[PDB]
């Protein structure tokens, strides 16, 4: 009768796949930042 069982209709869905986010500034844009610092810093 009462035994521990999955809820009616089943449980919801669970994520297993890697969700690592590729979030970053683009490389060219990045270089410019550091280069700009040097360029200005030198001036």
């Amino acid at each position: 009768v009462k035994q521990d069982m999955p809820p009616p209709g089943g449980y919801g869905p669970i994520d297993y796949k890697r969700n690592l986010p590729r979030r970053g500034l683009s490389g060219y844009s990045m270089f410019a930042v550091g280069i700009g610092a040097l360029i200005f810093g030198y001036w």
């Binding site: 009768v1 009462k2 035994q3 521990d4 796949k17 890697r18 969700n19 690592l20 986010p21 979030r23």
Partner: protein, 95 residues
């Protein structure tokens, strides 16, 4: 939880993930203790009829190993059918 929004936003960003949605610390989501009393189901063999054990005792109906090639044209035979190649996954073949 119980974190000022700003800390949460810093948290979510520095981590790169909505860590708030899936906090590790458990809060009032865990099964309450003293869950209701359990009436567990009785399995087969509890019938009061046509339940003869002799008809349900694989323990010793087992027999001594079958013997082949005792010391006391023909095609080649393998241990078993050659195995079947596994197939690449479809949800995530790579990575």
């Amino acid at each position: 939880a119980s974190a000022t929004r700003v800390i949460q936003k810093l948290r979510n960003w520095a981590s790169g993930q909505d860590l708030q949605a899936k906090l590790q610390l458990r809060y009032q989501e865990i099964a309450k203790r003293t869950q209701p009393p359990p009436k567990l189901p009785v399995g087969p063999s509890h019938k009061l009829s046509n339940n003869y054990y002799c008809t349900r005792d694989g323990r010793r109906e087992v027999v001594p190993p079958s013997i082949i090639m005792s010391s006391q044209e023909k095609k080649a035979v393998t241990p078993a059918p050659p195995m079947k190649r596994w197939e690449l996954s479809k949800d995530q073949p790579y990575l």
